[model samples]
Target: MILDTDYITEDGKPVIRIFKKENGEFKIDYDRNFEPYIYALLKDDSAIEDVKKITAERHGTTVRVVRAEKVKKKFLGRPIEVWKLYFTHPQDQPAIRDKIKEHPAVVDIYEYDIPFAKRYLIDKGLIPMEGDEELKMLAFAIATLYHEGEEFAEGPILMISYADEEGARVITWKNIDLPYVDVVSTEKEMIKRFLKVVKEKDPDVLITYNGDNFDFAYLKKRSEKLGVKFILGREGSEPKIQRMGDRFAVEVKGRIHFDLYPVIRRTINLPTYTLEAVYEAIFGQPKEKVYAEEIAQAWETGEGLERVARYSMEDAKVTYELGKEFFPMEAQLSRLVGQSLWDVSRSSTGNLVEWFLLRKAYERNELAPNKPDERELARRRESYAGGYVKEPERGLWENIVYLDFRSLYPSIIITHNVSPDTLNREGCEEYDVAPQVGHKFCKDFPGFIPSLLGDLLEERQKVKKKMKATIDPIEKKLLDYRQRLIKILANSFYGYYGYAKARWYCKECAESVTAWGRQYIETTIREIEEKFGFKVLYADTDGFFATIPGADAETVKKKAKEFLDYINAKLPGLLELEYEGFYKRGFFATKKKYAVIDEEDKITTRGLKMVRRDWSEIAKETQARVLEAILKHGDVEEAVRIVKEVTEKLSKYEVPPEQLVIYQPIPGTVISYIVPKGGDRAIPFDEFDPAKHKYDAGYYIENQVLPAVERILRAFGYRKEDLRYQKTRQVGLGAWL
Candidate 1:
């Protein structure tokens, strides 16, 4: 049960220190007998002599061992001879790799620039945070110097409000207030106290709200300035903070720095993802406010310090609960991908798929490809043929059957054997080939992607069966999460083939996958119309809506499932057509936009403004009433009456200010906010003054309400010119009657 790891040299030999959680306790396992290495490919015989003139030295430091073993290996499914550079220190490998790449014989490099800790884990075949190992969890929060009159470039950390699952503590720079405060210490001593707490608690998983870009980095900065040893690892090592794009990634030596902000961002979709908003979204509360922006003001006042301290502490509690909510899925993903929990917690779907591929490649003795440089990445940025999306007309319909494809892209990859190694190869007629893109794949040698997806699909079936068989709640939840994670990883293979920075990036493979997908869904659309005589109202890349006019709900469902069976018999590979549901009344406003009322009267909508972030609650409510009137009762006049009532409410300014507010993400930062009535200033919804500032009512009416309602009304022959917003009492209800 490896929880985390670190790379270093023990007595001049590169050693990997593994932090393990064995039977609910912390432990360390050191593997000092490891050599950090990278491989180099060559072209001709004369270049071998050119490679011998090399020095793998950096800053006048001599290399420990510049050994180049010309071993036989497979590069992209073909045999090739290349030099392997071995080094005592991980740092020496990159310097020598660059030195070798400068030679005339050097063609390319592989397995360079990989994080040392990640490399060690992959090489040792160890997955982080696996088994029934109890994860030692600790979540903390911080108060910054933004309100302390400090401005230029990331203010210092001023206060710390920390908590574990059972205990709570607080340390601040000054003794302004907070009756439950553990200590009132200097900024320097406060940090030292935090280190001591961390050392004692020894959290295997450290949770924070926005720790990556803020708390962790700020603490490190203040510690460096104060000359305090920020020793918080198992072996008394400091965290290594690196700037990764816009955010900083803090790599604690023996713990996973779990930042809940990005985890929530990637896991959930919301309008505003502030701590308060996420809490409300997860816990079912609203109109909440936190003391984030009031830090300076509250400290300056000196009266509200306790409340603010508790507010900061509450952030940690919320973050910890969120981590608990999402940790199971992330942990399962890490084990399945064979990476550490720290990496998986912060990784994208692309990274998950690639690392899984790399692990498989390692097991198969296939060489991993080098990351694309700037030129290659730029060249790979061009667009290609994408998925098919049918343009839909705006109208209302009845008795629609929605058929969905289970894992369409991955299924196509398995069915067509789509991969970079198999794309446009020698095989022509016997196996699956792309129709319009004209890409070919080998039948004899299966593509790694298809093989990997096949294994994953099989693994998911096993997990699903276990999930179904298990009666215990805990085991069932774990198995369910594991299967869901595998599905996500399996589905991301298609996009990974075309990702710009991907090592196995293949536009041809991507084009072929989408092409086959288009043909499958398109062919099914025509087949349903011609073979079954069911009218297909709409068809997308992986699903479609069909109806037999004048058929009842039971008959429609039965015919739809029969059509599904018919398609399954004709389809190839793991492609499956699943019956999503039978909708009593459905509306297609446009392509990728629709509203459906299922057999149970549950209203489901997609690509509609009612769910969009920019629309106010009033607008969403207005549209819902309109949808219910049309879908449930087929009364357009009742829908029009509701619209008039909504307009009258808006004209009277009767809606709450919070209900009228629409979240707007700031241009140059990650925080989302709202612009008040007069000037364009980004103020958070929590800080908004309802009496001093009002929402632009016209914008909500013209842009939000009318735009959402008029199009649906126009389908029934109501003109947009007649569907105007009311500005005053003189202009009120002119569009209606």
Candidate 2:
């Protein structure tokens, strides 16, 4: 097939014209004249009319590949074959791409469309390119400027607050610290004026807390009912309320409608996901809490309305600040993942990594595997033992050295070439074998996963270098976030391998990564104790805490270096350990459970439930106070005295209810709640019925009071019952000593 390639820029629209050789002369192949189109495979029986109905668009011609190829996909737990179905028509392309995803038989889709700047490179088989003049120009142009010749800027952000007053809807909006706040009387008025306000302000990004699930959805429903045009976009378009899996998203044309909740959730762990709680936790900005049940009454009454306004203002303020703080990170992540800011910001970790893989896989010409169906996911609902946890040496130790493998799982994946494509491949005799699992990966060629990881690692190193050389604090911060974001995405690969919802779910790949990790940690533990003469205090999957008795900090550091050198010398490929730091003293109770006080008197705890939310304040306080006394002051007697006093206070009810109040999340009742690391039960405050689940004072002493103090007190020779109030007075504090 001979063809003529022509580059034409007509009417400011760039087009690459192609003429095919037909008969004896060249003629245009009109069907293939436009830029490449990616197609989605549909079920065998899927009708064009049904597709059109679902997409709300007209249908294109349906065709099948002449030479059909089947890819083995792990669905549920068994393998299934998939075929490619094609459709061509510019108008119908997006509809089919979006609508066919809802079909049960539509197994998976392919690459949609690359950015305009990258189209040429991709067409020339040079895609997945970076630092290209065209790509950079397009990326910067898109990111910097919202429209042609317009300055790249985030327009005013408008936060919407809605309330029902006497069955009438009251909508309030505040542009970030703008001169005034606007309030509309009725739902119809609010809907009409909102579109007006949106046009007037033209915000680049609109933020909401639960707007997708409630506010936006509510506005859309109300507008439809009132026969009002709900034009909320700069392009004079109504917002699209899109159903994404189990959740909903409100997409506005020509603007970014970001739900701050999804992005915020990725960064922090909180007792409640309420805006007030999140704002307080992150920014130390205490927001007024407005109860859902009281919102209507609050709007109806006089002083109540003032309170409601203040509440709404605070919500807007926090929403604005949070969006500002998190948007930069999300934007940088979008660039790295090759996705739109709106999509990447709202996407989950699995989705983010999946896109990264998809982009890279296309560049490498590697086919992306289909996601496991529900049955396959259910069938593969088995867990592999993760990360080895060594038994901790209970009690205090001095001059402790801490060391951990850097990027343990990621490094393992790279060094061992752990990927689905390479697993159990032929002629893998000399390949690296995973411990316990006996899984082998081909050594001749690097797997797709490792190749992708290598690129990320290289990019991360470049960013780190730039960050170090950057003298400006603001620039350094920007660089820092970029690097951290890259690290987060790179590390997520190991977890993605095991994630059931992952498109490239491979149980063997995930299992092998962990198997190798455990083996490495165990080997480190053995070598540190036997050859290095350092006592291993505790060991987890990647790192271990150990000490050399009667040694100074300097001496400990020297020995640690020698130990690291020895380990690195023996380690295979990129697997190497680094010394975290030396601690003045440390305590260990169990595997993944310990605390360490560094030379600077700074304390850190791991696997201990003291810092968690579900435990009572007094319990956490008691444990923290005891740990400090022992680790910092080396005073066991003083620690015991503290515990005894707290226990006595609990028995007499002298402890404030606030301190005694144990907050546990009730599962299956609420979407968000906290369950303390050690506590198995979740007691949601709202749904707790005292009559149905009565608790005596003894229950507190036995369950809450005793458990909190036992881990530390037991190490000091106090029995579990001893920590509890004695039925009969026994020996004094001297007995514990």
Candidate 3:
């Protein structure tokens, strides 16, 4: 076995070095290893050597570390051998860092850029930094610092403080060296060694990528099997188990372990959820790399094991890069999660900051909020549909400004500021509003909490409009995606308020909020429709009010403002529902044949004719392509076009041997039909058996002639009519339409 080390010097002289792991020390022999390079250098191989050297320094570099078809010893009467490739720099002494850093494989770490990070955050619904305080804070943290704390809050307390700098809550100091980290092993041994090493370092928290499910879990199991007593030197020496991504880890007494996955995946929106995707997109792809197949094959041969170690280490180191990308707020998120349970154990109250704190506390089990049961979720369609609250009346088309209360239910709880704390039953009818739970807007009991959110929503709507105006089509599309999610997420608060799992599980509270909403919507509808002559299109429980044409949008908007104020002024017990936002020109389609997401992200209809006969390749293609375009890219027209082209070929039919048709028998129901393609006598549809009906209805219509014509007609969405069933007649079977 030999180690590679050969390169041409700047003067064109070949240089070589030899690295050997012997006697517990890696010896480096520059002279011997340089011989080949020295010889090549004399022959002016500088260009090739330089390229090779540069390639070796980066991450994910492809390198030939194993030969194909290598012979090996037999195991259990079967010959066994492994093939391998090096996708990263080979592991060696610490001095190899310089070479490794410059390798193409390391490109994954270096190519990371700001746009990628921002896009990632935005993709995750953490952008439009205007009023998103908590998200902004988190974004700041991710942009500035690295690693937003670990999984278990207590994991770190068990370990001694090595480094602590302001803004960087947890850092590895200069003098700490983890002695138990083993290089050669799988997940099981990895955790065992990690535990032993942690005890030595004695840190308060242990953090890693997927540390819970993979790292810590593997370590705990292996430790248990080895009977290694992992005492944290605290009162409760027994470690508790927890999952991290796909891995699992144990939390020692007085210590914490945090996985970076959740923070990166859930913290704030970023462009991607995957580490490499983030790393490469932000920094850039590595210059060094090996084909994926070559590397996968190497696992069997184990010839490139050293390269694998380097690649593994890169995964660990690059997370720091990711951490650096999303700083400050990640730091804040870390601090919030790291906070004492006694401080504030609320969940993410939909307030970015509060939500972060609450979310962390919930994860730590320091706070327990109610979550909807699977059964409730299953019944959501029926439960949350709001049931035809108000329908459109005839001749109701007038210009009407649509006003919606921002997250109506949540705002009610936060403003007039109703909570379990300040709701009163007295004088509730003073303004004709219901006071079921603790929510008061009329009384001057306290400053409004929802007011801030209301202002934020107003400001957001303004910004959103501006962005729409100036944004390019593609950028606008992306922005709309974010906006849609934001609205969806905001609207979810109503459900959460009524959710049985939330700490504020008040059905009465939800009801009180909706009662005000109902009044507001009905009153607004009347003012616009009857008084202003604008017809109300529809109204749901959440204050979704729509009106027809010929109505004054401005007047409707003004009236909505007045109504909002009136509700706010009178219903002092409930949060003031404000006119959050509305769209200019939106359309809805009740039919399903031709659905499309318009520019406004609102669903609309193209035309029903697009999908007719199920047998028409055109109809099926139209259905598939339109949906794909909408879901994947929001390109309705393009999707329609693609489907049109697909259906063009399918609009007509062809014939047998050249095509196949499939058909299913209705179990007991038997109908006689002529099998025109199969020369056999006509048989009963049931007698044709599912297993034997090779050419189906569609397949039977492949040709441009009669047989094809008949199949197409049957599939043209026409209902089946009855005919007396019989087995035998002239055309081969007793089938007539």
**Best candidate per lDDT, number?**
1
lDDT of 3 by residue, 116-177 (tens): 22212222333111221221110001101112353422121111111111122211211222
Q: Candidate 2: list runs displaced more than 4 Å.
A: 1-86, 89-179, 182-187, 292-295, 373-379, 428-430, 471-475, 609-621, 645-700, 724-737
The best-first sequence of candidates by TM-score reads 1, 2, 3
Q: How many Å off is the CA of 542 in candidate 1?
A: 0.9
Prediction-by-prediction clash tally: 1, 5, 137
Residues forming the 10-long window of minimal summed lDDT in candidate 3: 136-145
Predicted candidate 1 versus true structure: per-residue lDDT over 1-737, tens digit per residue: 88777767666567788888887677778787677788878887566656756766766877644466777777666678887777778888767777778777788878877777788888878877678877878888887757435553256676787766786667787674455476645778888888888888878888888888877677777777889988876777787787767767887777788888888899899977888889888888653354446777777667677777777667666777777877878888789998888788888888887888888887777888888889888899798888888776456778998888888898888877888877656645555668897877776678777888899999999999888789999878989889988888887888888898888888988988888889888999889889888988877788988898888878888888888889899888788889987888877777777778886889887777555456666777788889899989978788887877777676667877767656545632345455555645547777877778776666666777888888677666676445554444554576563
**Candidate 3 TM-score, C-alpha based:** 0.42
As for candidate 1, its clashing pairs are 147-296
Tens digits of lDDT, candidate 2, 1-737: 21223344453234653333333332432223444344445556344334334433453434222222345443222234444333333333454555557766665565444333233333454322122111100000000002234332221112244211111122453222222345545545645775664565445567677767766665665566678887875446788788878988877655567787887787887767877778788888677666533454443342345555455555655666676667666656766776656677778889888877766765665555666668988977899978888777777788998899999998999998888878887665558888899988887777888878988899899999998799998668877888999899889999998898887888899999999999999988889889978998888789988888778789888888998998899998889899888888887876656778888899887766544545666777887788889889988778877877777776765655545556545522233322221234645445544445432355556666567767766665777756555545557896673
The regions of model 1 sitting more than 4 angstroms off are: 10-13, 44-53, 152-158, 172-180, 185-189, 224-227, 285-288, 292-294, 427-429, 611-622, 637-705, 722-737
10 residues in a row with least lDDT, candidate 2: 136-145
TM-score of each: 0.86, 0.73, 0.42
Q: Which of the two, 1 or 2, has more TM-score?
A: 1
Q: Which ranges in model 3 have alpha carbons more than 4 Å from their true place?
A: 1-205, 224-256, 261-297, 304-314, 321-402, 414-417, 421-432, 435-504, 531-586, 591-648, 651-737
